[PDB]
Design a protein around this ligand. Structure first.
Ligand SMILES: [Cl-]
Length: 238
């Protein structure tokens, strides 16, 4: 009754790893269960990653494209997935809920599967404003989409305090977050949509923590940093 899990790998600069070697590792990895694996990379590595990742349960995702011609070109190039709204887009680049929403709408229109990221800050979490922050974030996204559009959409729930910090959310925190996201999608979009929607957890997921997190009722996989432990995160999606 859970939808198809997704294990998404999100590439970031100054990774100590070789991308190529990580691709080689992923290519060798047998994945017995049904899961869509996604290697999201930055522009300059898109061509190398496409060239080189041939695991068929893997798709390449672009990241943060917001231009008509660039979306169109990525699609041309055979890139069908895109990650958008990721934490630093919001807290650093100044991408508002609306800018992310418009990027998500543009990508869907261009035939992309979209991993749309949402998530609260340390401060937002601490003052109990997680729900309102994250529901505001997704509400902005939902405003720009139509019901059919949700088939192309994936939500990555990422607490900002958990991204890259070694501080993972607890199964109860991830479940609470995912549950309210899905409750909101249910009530505001439809229970068929909430039902089919992949809500992924991200922020300091590793091998050990992942399977407990995937056990949670509303967790449909993970958005994780592209690192060799990602393989163990893939396995946890059962
Ligand atoms: Cl497996």
């Amino acid at each position: 009754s859970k939808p198809q899990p997704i294990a998404a790998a999100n590439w970031k600069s100054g990774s100590p790893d070789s991308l190529s070697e990580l691709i080689d590792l992923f290519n060798s990895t047998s994945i017995n269960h049904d899961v869509q694996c996604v290697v999201a990379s930055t522009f300059v590595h898109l061509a190398m990653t496409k060239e080189r990742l041939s695991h068929p349960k893997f798709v390449i995702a672009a990241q943060n494209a917001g231009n008509a011609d660039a979306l169109a070109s990525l699609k041309d190039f055979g890139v069908n997935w895109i990650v958008l709204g990721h934490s630093e887009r919001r807290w650093y680049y100044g991408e508002t809920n609306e800018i992310v929403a418009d990027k998500v709408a543009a990508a869907v229109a261009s035939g992309f599967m979209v991993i749309a990221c949402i998530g609260e800050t340390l401060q937002e979490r601490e003052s109990g404003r997680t729900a309102v922050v994250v529901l505001t974030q997704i509400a902005a996204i939902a405003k720009k989409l139509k019901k059919a559009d949700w088939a192309k959409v994936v939500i990555a729930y990422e607490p900002v305090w958990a991204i890259g910090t070694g501080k993972v959310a607890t199964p109860q925190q991830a479940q609470e977050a995912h549950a309210l996201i899905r409750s909101w999608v249910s009530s505001k979009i439809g229970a068929d949509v909430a039902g089919e929607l992949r809500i992924l957890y991200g922020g300091s997921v590793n091998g050990k923590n992942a399977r407990t997190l995937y056990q949670q009722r509303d967790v449909n996989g993970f958005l994780a940093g592209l690192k060799p432990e990602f393989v163990d995160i893939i396995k946890a999606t059962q």
